Every structure is written in C-alpha cells, then in structure tokens.
Design a protein around this ligand. Structure first.
Ligand SMILES: OC[C@H](C[C@H](O)c1ccccc1)Nc1ncnc2[nH]ccc12
Ligand SMILES: [Cl-]
Length: 167
C-alpha cells in the first residue's frame, strides 16, 4: 500500500492520472520523482522547468554542479539527484527529443532506468515538448517498466485519449 490516490490501473504495475506532477509530488512526497531531463540538465521548460521552479531553482544549482563534475548525460540515460522539497530523490531521465532529431528507439532505454527503483512518480518520457507520440510513450512504458510507476499526464484531453486508446 502506498499514498498515491485517484489513479487508473492500466496493468499490474502501471497507473495513470490526469495531474500536475509538481502538485502530485508536493502532496505525495514520493521516494522518487522522475524528471523529463535533457543531457545538460538545463531545466528550462516542460516538466523540468516546472519541477525546477517548484524547488526555487535549487534543482538547477545542484544540476549545474553535477554537469561540471561529470559532463552531460547520454540520451537514454539518467542520474539520481536530490528531490529537494518534492521527493526524496529525483531521477533525471533523458528521453529522445524528436525536435532534435534523436532516435525514438532510445525511448525504451530511457524507460529501463525506471526499473532500478521500486516505485516512481513519473511523466510520459519524450512527450510534450520532446515531440514524441504520447500513445507510443505509454506503450513503451507499459512494455518496459516492471517496477511500480504512477504516471501523471498534465493535459486532460490527452489523458482521456491515452485511456480510451489503451490496449
Ligand atoms: O509528456 C510530457 C507532459 C506533456 C503534457 O501532458 C501535455 C501538455 C500539452 C499538450 C499535451 C500534453 N508534460 C507534463 N506532464 C506532467 N506534469 C507536468 N507538469 C508540467 C509539465 C508536465
Ligand atoms: Cl512537456
């Protein structure tokens, strides 16, 4: 039993809700919130910009130190950093950005990072401003993640389409 509320159950381990991941994180304070990161951990817009804003830019400050030490992430890769006021940890995961010409096949590799964590609050990787088809992202999530994932879909109209089209 966990403290996630109001989710629709898609499979044994995947759950979905129309919700603002910032507000969801602030309420649940999950062990792991997933950020839709880029390789530079520059949290300017989309989920990343919203999460970082909610941390009063502390996420960005921490991320800049991470990059200065370690260099950029790989597309498909991840790193674990602080969750600040939102979660214990933030798993920064880089899905491919279609608007940069990145290989959509890397979306599966991106979701594989979730399997290192028993329970996560997450967005649909590569959705929104990353330019991929969210129906495809949900399918890859369901077919790749084996741990317990609670998906927040910000857009209500998109949420309804993902549910109604879910196989
Ligand atoms: O897949 C990324 C997802 C896209 C979003 O659902 C969308 C917005 C407009 C049109 C269609 C779809 N972004 C988020 N998901 C959850 N919480 C969030 N908080 C801030 C951003 C955000
Ligand atoms: Cl987005």
């Amino acid at each position: 039993v966990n403290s996630f509320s109001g989710y629709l159950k898609l499979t044994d381990n995947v759950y979905i809700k129309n919700a603002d991941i910032v507000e969801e994180a602030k309420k649940v304070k999950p062990t792991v919130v997933v950020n839709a990161a880029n390789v530079y951990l520059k949290h300017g817009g989309g989920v990343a910009g919203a999460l970082n804003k909610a941390t009063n830019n502390a996420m960005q400050v921490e991320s800049d130190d991470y990059i200065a030490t370690n260099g950029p992430l790989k597309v498909g890769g991840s790193c674990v950093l602080s969750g600040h006021n939102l979660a214990k940890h933030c798993l920064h995961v880089v899905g491919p950005n279609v608007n940069k010409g990145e290989d959509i096949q890397l979306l599966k590799s991106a979701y594989e990072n979730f399997n290192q964590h028993e329970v996560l609050l997450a967005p649909l990787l590569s959705a929104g401003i990353f330019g991929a088809d969210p129906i495809h992202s949900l399918r890859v999530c369901v077919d790749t993640v084996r741990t317990n994932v609670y998906l927040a879909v910000f857009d209500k109209n998109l949420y309804d389409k993902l549910v109604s089209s879910f196989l």
